[PDB]
Amino acid sequence: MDIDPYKEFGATVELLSFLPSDFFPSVRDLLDTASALYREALESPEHCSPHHTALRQAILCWGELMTLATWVGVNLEDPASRDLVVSYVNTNMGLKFRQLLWFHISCLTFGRETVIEYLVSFGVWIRTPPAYRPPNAPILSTL
Amino acid sequence: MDIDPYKEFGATVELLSFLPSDFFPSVRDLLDTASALYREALESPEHCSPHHTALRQAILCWGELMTLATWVGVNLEDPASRDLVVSYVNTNMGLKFRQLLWFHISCLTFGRETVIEYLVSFGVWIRTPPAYRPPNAPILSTL
Amino acid sequence: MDIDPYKEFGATVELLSFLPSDFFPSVRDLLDTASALYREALESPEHCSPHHTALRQAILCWGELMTLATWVGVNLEDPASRDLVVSYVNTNMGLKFRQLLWFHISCLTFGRETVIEYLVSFGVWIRTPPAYRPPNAPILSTL
Amino acid sequence: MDIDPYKEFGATVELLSFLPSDFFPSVRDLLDTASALYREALESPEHCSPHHTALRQAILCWGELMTLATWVGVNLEDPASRDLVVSYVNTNMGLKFRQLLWFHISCLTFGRETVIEYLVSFGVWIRTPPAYRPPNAPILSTL
Numbered sequence: 009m010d011i012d013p014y015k016e017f018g019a020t021v022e023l024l025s026f027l028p029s030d031f032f033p034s035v036r037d038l039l040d041t042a043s044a045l046y047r048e049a050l051e052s053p054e055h056c057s058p059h060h061t062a063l064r065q066a067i068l069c070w071g072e073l074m075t076l077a078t079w080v081g082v083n084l085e086d087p088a089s090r091d092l093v094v095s096y097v098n099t100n101m102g103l104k105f106r107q108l109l110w111f112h113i114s115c116l117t118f119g120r121e122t123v124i125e126y127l128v129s130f131g132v133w134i135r136t137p138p139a140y141r142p143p144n145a146p147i148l149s150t151l
Numbered sequence: 152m153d154i155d156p157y158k159e160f161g162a163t164v165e166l167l168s169f170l171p172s173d174f175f176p177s178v179r180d181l182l183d184t185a186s187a188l189y190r191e192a193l194e195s196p197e198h199c200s201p202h203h204t205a206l207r208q209a210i211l212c213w214g215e216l217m218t219l220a221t222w223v224g225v226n227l228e229d230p231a232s233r234d235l236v237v238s239y240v241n242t243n244m245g246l247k248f249r250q251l252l253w254f255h256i257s258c259l260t261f262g263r264e265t266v267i268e269y270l271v272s273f274g275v276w277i278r279t280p281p282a283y284r285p286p287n288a289p290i291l292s293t294l
Numbered sequence: 295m296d297i298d299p300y301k302e303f304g305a306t307v308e309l310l311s312f313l314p315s316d317f318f319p320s321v322r323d324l325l326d327t328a329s330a331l332y333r334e335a336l337e338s339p340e341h342c343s344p345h346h347t348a349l350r351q352a353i354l355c356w357g358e359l360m361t362l363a364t365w366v367g368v369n370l371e372d373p374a375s376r377d378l379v380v381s382y383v384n385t386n387m388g389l390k391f392r393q394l395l396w397f398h399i400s401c402l403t404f405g406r407e408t409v410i411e412y413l414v415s416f417g418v419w420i421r422t423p424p425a426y427r428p429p430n431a432p433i434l435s436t437l
Numbered sequence: 438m439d440i441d442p443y444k445e446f447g448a449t450v451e452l453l454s455f456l457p458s459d460f461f462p463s464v465r466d467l468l469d470t471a472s473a474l475y476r477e478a479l480e481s482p483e484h485c486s487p488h489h490t491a492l493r494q495a496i497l498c499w500g501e502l503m504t505l506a507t508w509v510g511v512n513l514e515d516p517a518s519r520d521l522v523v524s525y526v527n528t529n530m531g532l533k534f535r536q537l538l539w540f541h542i543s544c545l546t547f548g549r550e551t552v553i554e555y556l557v558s559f560g561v562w563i564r565t566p567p568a569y570r571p572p573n574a575p576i577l578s579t580l
């Protein structure tokens with residue numbers, strides 16, 4: 009079916025493509041962050057939050073994709089296709105994964121309205137010209 | 152992270168290992184059941200329930216895995232690799248997909264208590280040797 | 295008929311003639327901004343605002359002009375005339391279009407009074423010669 | 438963004454398609470009418486009505502297209518290109534322009550409900566076979 013993984017939260021793919029693809033941190037970095045900050049609540053037997061649920065399912069899915077790609081590469085004999093699997097994964101699905109993880113982690117941490125206003129402001133900013141925008145890229149802080 | 156996609160909901164992979172592997176319906180049947188009973192909810196912008204929050208993500212994961220295997224079978228001129236990848240997807244991950252779909256659809260339709268009782272009772276019925284096994288296995292029913 | 299597209303909103307062309315070309319984001323950027331911030335209200339059957347109405351009509355104009363430029367590229371076998379028409383369209387019409395899109399988005403975003411005070415101040419700043427005006431221009435920003 | 442210029446007023450492209458392309462008056466005639474009837478308003482500094490706003494924007498776009506056509510006629514020596522461009526502009530873009538002009542002038546003048554009932558009645562007419570199609574095609578009146 010046609011589902012938007014964010015509209016149950018108050019966002020949309022059209023709104024997260026409003027940021028450059030070179031903005032979203034790497035998958036490994038986001039997973040490390042997620043461990044460090046919410047391992048005890050993702051591994052928890054509680055409906056702690058919809059973000060927790062969705063993040064769990066996403067992590068399991070990335071793990072299964074990784075498993076599959078490693079298996080294909082290990083079985084295949086020639087590199088041309090022993091690589092193309094993991095390569096295409098990190099190309100097309102890595103972006104979706106890290107957009108979604110960024111969303112969920114950032115929300116759980118800072119706030120949903122904050123993350124949304126940040127998306128909007130950062131798009132407006134990265135689209136405005138430098139002479140007439142503030143010079144420092146926007147960023148999220150708990151400090 | 153070792154996440155159990157069920158302990159959040161009050162279960163485990165073990166409790167679901169009582170059911171054999173050939174017990175679980177086809178992914179087509181289960182996707183049809185979902186599109187029938189819970190579509191307006193899985194497309195809604197609401198946290199209708201953690202079951203929905205999980206089912207949306209799992210369906211997106213399955214779609215992306217399908218796209219992967221298809222792009223593979225297409226761009227890979229080795230039909231052996233095509234077949235192996237796309238059918239191993241089924242072999243290994245479809246069983247998990249349909250376990251999770253079964254669990255969620257059944258805890259939505261009938262309930263958590265009813266489903267866990269069903270799991271216990273079916274485990275009894277199946278661990279029981281045949282000679283003493285009644286032919287009327289437990290079936291989940293609203294009627 | 296001597297129509298001023300801002301006289302209805304309390305502004306004028308003479309008040310936006312000071313804003314240079316390097317001030318206005320690209321057409322693509324402004325369109326993405328609108329699509330991300332106001333799509334569910336520009337595609338809506340409500341009279342959400344004069345700015346919404348005007349944005350709708352201007353986007354329709356621009357879409358038809360892009361259709362024209364495509365038809366040109368396809369039906370004009372004179373590369374010179376073809377490229378000259380396309381460049382005229384883009385440069386001139388997109389400059390006017392960026393001007394108007396900016397006015398409307400900025401108003402909807404900040405306020406009519408804020409946008410007009412900002413225009414007055416930017417005019418003061420841009421009339422001042424460089425030897426007596428600060429180097430850092432005024433700035434309209436949510437941040 | 439896919440936008441319907443009539444959906445905020447209470448109609449739909451699929452509804453004004455009931456009327457043939459050779460039904461709408463000349464752009465000349467429609468502009469004469471709009472001038473004579475609402476010039477003091479389309480030149481006004483007031484959101485007199487959404488129809489007024491939309492008409493302002495449309496007439497501005499038509500004026501820019503006229504300026505384009507003159508620029509072509511003077512610059513481009515290639516007669517085939519010049520004429521093809523002017524003809525495309527007038528024919529197609531003016532078909533759309535006079536659809537819009539007609540809708541807005543007619544609404545402002547007679548009424549939205551009147552215009553929509555007229556659309557459905559004209560559909561009835563044009564659908565009725567010529568053996569039973571009265572020659573008195575429906576027409577909008579204030580009497």
Ligand SMILES: COCCOCCOCCOc1ccc(C(C)(C)CC(C)(C)C)cc1
Pocket residue numbers: 065068069070072156164208209212213216242243244245246247248251
């Ligand atoms: C080969 O099957 C063995 C059955 O035992 C399952 C053991 O693993 C636990 C399965 O749990 C899941 C369920 C779903 C999933 C996701 C959400 C990632 C969906 C999937 C598998 C379709 C990608 C991941 C793990």
Ligand SMILES: COCCOCCOCCOc1ccc(C(C)(C)CC(C)(C)C)cc1
Pocket residue numbers: 013021066069070099100101102103104105108208211212213215
């Ligand atoms: C190259 O990526 C472009 C961005 O795509 C935009 C998103 O398109 C709609 C679908 O979005 C998602 C988001 C996440 C996912 C899941 C949860 C399955 C995770 C993933 C991407 C790791 C497979 C699937 C689809």
Ligand SMILES: COCCOCCOCCOc1ccc(C(C)(C)CC(C)(C)C)cc1
Pocket residue numbers: 351354355356358359442450494495498499529530531532533534536537
């Ligand atoms: C070839 O003509 C097709 C007839 O129109 C079918 C309906 O198309 C819907 C779009 O309608 C309009 C109407 C007006 C316009 C504007 C106001 C932008 C004016 C125009 C046509 C001069 C560009 C754009 C689209």
Ligand SMILES: COCCOCCOCCOc1ccc(C(C)(C)CC(C)(C)C)cc1
Pocket residue numbers: 299307352355356359385386387388389390391393394395494497498499501
């Ligand atoms: C070439 O641009 C120079 C700057 O403009 C100077 C005059 O400013 C007045 C702007 O007038 C318009 C006219 C039309 C428009 C719309 C939005 C209808 C778009 C267009 C140009 C595609 C017709 C916008 C502004």
